[PDB]
Amino acid sequence: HHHMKVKDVCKLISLKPTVVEEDTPIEEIVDRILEDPVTRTVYVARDNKLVGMIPVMHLLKVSGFHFFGFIPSMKRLIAKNASEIMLDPVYVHMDTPLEEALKLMIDNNIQEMPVVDEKGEIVGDLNSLEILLALWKGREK
Amino acid sequence: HHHMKVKDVCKLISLKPTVVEEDTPIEEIVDRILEDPVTRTVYVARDNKLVGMIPVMHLLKVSGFHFFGFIPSMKRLIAKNASEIMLDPVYVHMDTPLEEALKLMIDNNIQEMPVVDEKGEIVGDLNSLEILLALWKGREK
């Protein structure tokens, strides 16, 4: 559909990626999300390289287990930090087809992904709302 | 965990529910989400009664099928309005246990739910961030 790429969609809204360190306490991750509540995925870096991600729904799931014992495999929090809960990063590039990015979002059940260069570094951001904007504000045919 | 109820969490952030009508075009639903980008679930009312909901991830899925033919059962959009895509509403009440509300979010894969009174009318709102705030900003033990 119109051969759009990530580069065409990732600047449609001004988003700032939320990036933490591996030893960042989960409470501070929550503080970061509450300050920028559009945030849907937290990233974890080490020496400016992308090393994990924490989707808000993953944090919600981790939280339900820790506080209520709810299982939607899950293990006990000890340090209560980013490295205990981060998942392997799912990311896009500037030249990535918009359709591959939407597929990734859906398959991984996330709504925000980082855009990375070829050395694992964050150069931009993409969310579901940008994709929606592109698709429904642009020409249907 | 601390016997919290929806009433204790649903005012921790100032949220305004996003509410559309059944004949509201999907493009206008997108415009409403872009104006208040914290929004994670759109509600559909008729005569001030709650009749459906559209989670943003449901809209993303509907969009991938319509524009790219991506199947994560799904049918062709004709009117392209709220009533063609709305799902049966999942909701809470003020006296609902916080833990039942988190379970609902997780089981239905949504992050925003309306709080309704006993006659199907919207009296407040709840999102995942409020639950996170409550759990991690309050006393752990």
Does CATH number 3.10.100.10 belong to domain B1-141? no
Query: Chain B: residue nearest A34 by CA?
Result: B129
Disruptive mutation site among A58, A106, A131 for chain B (greatest number of B CBs within 10 Å) = A106
**Burial class, A38, CB count within 10 angstroms (exposed 0-12 / middle 13-18 / buried 19+):** middle
User: Which tokens is B141 given?
Assistant: 């033990």
8 Å CB contact of A107 and B72:
yes
Quick one: which H or E segment has residue A94? Answer: none
Domain ranges for chain B, please list them: 1-141
Say which of A37, A68, A129 has its CB closest to residue B1.
A68
* 3-class DSSP string for chain B: CCCCEHHHHCCCCCCCCEEECCCCEHHHHHHHHHHCCCCCEEEEEECCEEEEEEEHHHHHHHHHHHHHCCCCCCCCCCCCEHHHHCECCCCECCCCEHHHHHHHHHHHCCCEEEEECCCCCEEEEEEHHHHHHHHHHCCCC
Instruction: Give CA angle at A5 (B67, B70), nearest 5°.
Output: 30
- DSSP assignments along A22-46, one per residue: TT-BHHHHHHHHHHSTT--EEEEEE
3-state secondary structure of A95: coil
Experimentally, the structure was elucidated by X-ray
Quick one: which H or E segment has residue A4? Answer: none
Q: Are strands B18-20 and B41-46 parallel, antiparallel or unpaired?
A: parallel
Say which of B60, B99, B103 has its CB closest to residue A132.
B60
- A98 and A34 Cβ atoms separated by less than 8 Å: no
> How far is A15 from A105, CA to CA, in rounded Å?
17
Q: Where are the beta strands (DSSP E) in A1-141?
A: 18-20, 41-46, 49-55, 112-116, 122-127
| CA distance, residue B7 to nearest chain A CA (Å) | 18
What residues are paired with B136 via a beta bridge? none
- B39 and B32 Cβ atoms separated by less than 8 Å: yes
3-state secondary structure of A85: helix
Nearest Cα to Cα of residue B72 among B81, B59, B82: B59
Quick one: which H or E segment has residue A100? Answer: helix A98-108
**Burial class, A4, CB count within 10 angstroms (exposed 0-12 / middle 13-18 / buried 19+):** middle
Q: Which residues have CB under 8 Å from A36's CB, separation 6+?
A: A16, A18
What residues are paired with A46 via a beta bridge? A49
